[PDB]
């Protein structure tokens, strides 16, 4: 990279403003008043002392991150707090343990009963900074609102040997730890939903407007990932893909009569061309509606017709 670093943390521009002459106020002559002040622009001194000029770090304060839907991040003192609305606590504590055991941090002490543990030093690898940080953390699971709180407390923080006690870092690296676990739980959940789908029906549906579409098993993300591949067997080559819109575009051609019954369903009888698709999120299912290359939703006929075809595509 040969960037030399140190630049990202400091303000842009010269420090010349720092040099500015001290505001001396002039003493009043004998028997004369000076309108001492009327307007604003008056200046209060607090003596700080905080960092000034370049020394001051202006990096965006890390925020605790709540990947789970309906998860509260609050930060106070040296503690990052993630609250998640779940059933039981004693089962989530070892999920956390699986995450950290995957990350391989050193465990000085542990306690499944108290659901709390104390780690050895943790070494970070941030590009924005030159001297890497060491963190000692206690991590614990305490249910407070009948939903549990994953709590991270940065016991000892060390910047290249010297123990640090500046404010920002405490947060940034408490939160680093926080975001590490939070991410990890996201990965446990997604890897589990995905693996459960892979290792393991299509059904006709109403869709709230009376128009016809197909509800397929699986969450939005999983179903999305699997959609194009599942769309080779159907005979549609994916042109446009957009998850943030759930809109795919396709250039469909019918396979041969030879090519229909390997899959296991008969032909649906639709004219070849440039169609469009809308995907939707149900917590554990997904919506999928198609539109004529001109631009009109199929009738309940063709719709119900492609259920067998699609459920033949998803047979693994």
């Amino acid at each position: 990279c040969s960037s030399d670093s140190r630049y990202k943390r400091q303000v842009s521009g010269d420090e010349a403003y720092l040099e500015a002459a001290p505001l001396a106020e002039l003493h009043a002559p004998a028997g004369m008043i000076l309108p001492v002040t009327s307007g604003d622009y008056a200046i209060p001194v607090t003596n700080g002392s905080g960092a000034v000029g370049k020394a001051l770090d202006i990096r965006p304060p890390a925020q605790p991150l709540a990947l789970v839907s309906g998860a509260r991040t609050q930060f106070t003192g040296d503690t990052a707090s993630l609250l998640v609305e779940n059933g039981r606590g004693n089962t989530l504590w070892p999920q956390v343990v699986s995450v950290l055991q995957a990350k391989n941090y050193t465990i000085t002490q542990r306690d499944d009963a108290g659901q709390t543990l104390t780690t050895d030093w943790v070494q970070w690898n941030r590009l924005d900074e030159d001297e890497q940080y060491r963190g000692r953390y206690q991590i614990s699971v305490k249910p407070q609102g009948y939903q549990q709180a994953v709590t991270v407390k940065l016991l000892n923080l060390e910047q290249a040997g010297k123990p640090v006690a500046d404010a920002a870092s405490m947060q940034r690296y408490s939160t680093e730890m926080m975001n590490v676990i939070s991410a990890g739980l996201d990965k446990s959940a997604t890897d589990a939903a995905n693996a459960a789908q892979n290792r393991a029906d299509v059904q006709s549906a109403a869709d709230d407007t009376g128009l016809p579409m197909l509800v397929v098993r699986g969450p939005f993300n999983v179903v999305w990932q699997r959609l194009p591949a599942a769309l080779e067997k159907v005979g549609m080559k994916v042109t446009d893909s957009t998850r943030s819109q759930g809109n795919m575009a396709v250039t469909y051609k019918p396979l041969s009569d030879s090519d229909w019954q390997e899959l296991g369903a008969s032909d649906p009888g639709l004219a070849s061309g440039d169609y469009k698709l809308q995907v939707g999120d149900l917590d554990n299912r997904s919506s999928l509606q198609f539109i004529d290359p001109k631009g009109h939703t199929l009738t309940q006929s063709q719709n119900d017709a492609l259920v067998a075809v699609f459920q033949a595509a998803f047979s693994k």
Binding site: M32, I33, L34, P35
Partner: protein
């Protein structure tokens, strides 16, 4: 040496001597305000004082000045009325 030309300056108030007549000593600043209007400058420290300068100057015709100084009492009362032309 010779003066080819310059644009003309202008100043506030344009006292009409008739307006200078309508005022008498012992007035509150408000009555004064009613006729004389907002002095651009009050003495910052001497006391209550109102300064009325008609200071016209056409281009390269020199400066022509008049100066009306009004000194008030601490209890909001006019005590001194000084009128200058030129000097």
């Amino acid at each position: 040496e010779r003066v080819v030309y310059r644009p003309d300056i202008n100043q506030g108030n344009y006292l009409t001597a008739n307006d200078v007549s309508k005022i008498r000593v012992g007035m509150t600043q408000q009555q004064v305000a009613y006729a004389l209007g907002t002095p651009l400058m009050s003495d910052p420290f001497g006391t209550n004082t109102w300064f009325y300068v008609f200071r016209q100057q056409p281009g390269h015709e020199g400066v022509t000045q008049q100066t009306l100084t009004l000194t008030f009492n601490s209890s909001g009362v006019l005590t001194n009325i000084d009128n200058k032309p030129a000097l």
